[PDB]
Design a protein around this ligand. Structure first.
Ligand SMILES: [Mg+2]
Ligand SMILES: [Mg+2]
Lengths: 121, 133, 121, 133
């Protein structure tokens, strides 16, 4: 049972927000709206197609934050020669989706963008 | 005796190449320049960092900001987070390959001693490393 | 008499942290360690000379975050043709210092670096 | 109308140049190519940016990531933060000149429609804008 303004699709509820925030603030903001809510997560091309239909109140050529962060430091690394890698060498980068063709862009987490929150009902 | 034009450090031969090539092509080039050749590998906490940084600083054209090294993201996926912020696992992925940065290079700022990951298709000068002949 | 492990200098208390954080997290972290604390601020070369003695445990050649952020989005901008600039525009960069030679580098705030906190409160 | 080589849009003439020049030389150059000529300015709320992005994409030749535009930081200080995070006023400073980025350019990523500020001494291709002939 999701409160108004938050649209629904396949058991979950999503809502586009016209606030301009850094990824960390957007994520935090989402968790402070409703219990267990977070930045939107895409489990299927279909789910992204739906969410794309909620970005109506947005400028274009721009992107929307989705729930992926520090995507480079989370990686494994290896040298091309026999040297073994000894386990933060990358910048804090996050993922935003462009609502035109739903492709994802990896950009600095400090960019101010609109976002979509999501949660289970 | 390292071949002419190559510098020695802790039992190996090194050389900075001004030619700009994408990461994969640079690695191939290094393997062709000497048997045992590869894009340089670096033990960050040793004097190897300063030695390689110096080789680039002293020979790279003033305008180039990067020099490839042999480090790359191992992951096959385009981005490395295995789960979304909501805790659900990442399966579906639709990343614009141009924002994918899996290849590492020495950065000009601070003297080519620190690393940064870049789009692998970018063409940059680089450093090769090989065992002595 | 600064808190445990903090060093005194002309009244203020300082402390080098060998933790890797992006600028916003480091500044935030400092404010949480002691009431009124922030990332270090240099009002003189002498103060910088003192701080340098606290950074030995850092990666040689690297830099540490100091208290200057978003240095470009606080600027005024102008077009060469005289057209007025219509006020997100620039990269979000912060200042980090190289202890050895006290030189300040302006770099992405999204970089993860060691830092120094300070407080006179 | 526009002279040969220049593309017309909304009554004005635009042209991408491949010669690499620093920001200031590019502006000076644009001013000599035609009366009233300048590095392109962009009313980012109109189709001018789309046109300019397309123009660069179609006529650029190189892996070049940047093309200068006519926007620059006006401030005389090295950087614009006048206060430290602790409220202190900034007086003493030792900023490295090459990290100062006051000149804007169009970035290859996203189609040369988004801007980025860079070290003004960098040499990049550029776009000029001048009134019709
Ligand atoms: Mg989901
Ligand atoms: Mg101070």
């Amino acid at each position: 049972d999701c409160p108004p303004d938050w649209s629904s699709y396949e058991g979950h509820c999503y809502r586009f927000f016209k606030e301009w925030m850094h990824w960390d603030d957007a994520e935090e903001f989402c968790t402070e709206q409703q219990t267990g809510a977070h930045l939107v997560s895409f489990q299927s091309k279909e789910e992204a197609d739906f969410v794309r239909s909620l970005t109506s109140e947005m400028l274009k050529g721009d992107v929307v934050w989705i729930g992926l962060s520090d995507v480079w430091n989370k990686c494994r690394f290896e040298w091309t020669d026999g040297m073994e890698f000894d386990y933060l060498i990358a910048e804090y980068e996050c993922v935003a989706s462009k609502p035109t063709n739903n492709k994802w862009w990896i950009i600095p987490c400090t960019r101010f963008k609109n976002f979509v929150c999501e949660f289970q009902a | 005796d390292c071949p002419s034009g190559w510098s020695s450090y802790e039992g190996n031969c090194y050389k900075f190449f001004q030619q700009k090539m994408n990461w994969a092509d640079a690695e191939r080039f290094c393997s062709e320049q000497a048997k045992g050749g590869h894009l340089v590998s670096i033990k960050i906490y040793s004097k190897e960092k300063d030695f390689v940084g110096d080789l680039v600083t002293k020979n790279i054209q003033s305008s180039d900001l990067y020099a490839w090294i042999g480090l790359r993201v191992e992951n096959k996926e385009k981005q490395c987070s295995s789960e979304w912020s909501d805790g659900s696992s990442v399966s579906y992925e639709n990343v614009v390959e141009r924002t994918v940065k899996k290849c590492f290079a020495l950065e000009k700022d601070l003297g080519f001693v620190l690393w940064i990951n870049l789009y692998c298709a970018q063409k940059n000068p680089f450093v090769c490393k090989s065992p002595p002949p």
